Every structure is written in C-alpha cells, then in structure tokens.
C-alpha cells in the first residue's frame, strides 16, 4: 500500500497499388 | 504527358457527347414555354378584332 512517485508513472506510460498500375499505363 | 493529353481528348470527347444532348434538351423544353406564349399570342387576333 505505498504511493508510488509520479517519475516512474510517467516513465512506465492495398491503398498503394490502386495507383502504380494506374501511373505505369496512363 | 502524351499518354496523359490522350486519355484526356477523348475525355474531352465524352464531355462533347455530354454537352450536346444537355443543349437539344434545353431547345426542346424552350418550344412547349414557347407554344404557350403563341396560343396568347393568337387569343389576340379576336381580342382585338372585338
């Protein structure tokens, strides 16, 4: 049941391809 | 960019082929406003023989 500091709580805590084919032929 | 400019002309070609049937809808649907105003225009003949 000790506290425990706050220091060491703070411590502690397909979209690609659409495209490509897309710029290879047009 | 030639690729580019000719995906775009017949782009261009489906905006014409758009375009053309939007300004034959528009001359029909001015003649029915139009004929309206000629039976107006044609009560006149008596309206004024009276």
């Known amino acids: 049941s000790l506290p425990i500091e ?3 709580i703070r411590e502690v805590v397909s979209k690609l391809m659409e495209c490509v ?3 290879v032929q047009t | 960019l030639g690729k580019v400019s000719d995906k775009s002309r ?3 070609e489906k905006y014409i082929e758009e375009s053309q049937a939007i ?3 528009l001359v029909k649907l ?3 406003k ?3 105003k000629f039976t107006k225009l044609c009560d006149l003949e008596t309206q004024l023989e009276m």
């Open chain 2, 30 to 32: 001015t003649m029915e």
């Open chain 2, 10 to 12: 017949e782009i261009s």
């Open chain 2, 34 to 36: 139009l004929e309206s």
């Open chain 2, 23 to 25: 300004i034959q809808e």
């Open chain 1, 6 to 8: 706050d220091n060491y």
């Open chain 1, 21 to 23: 084919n897309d710029a």
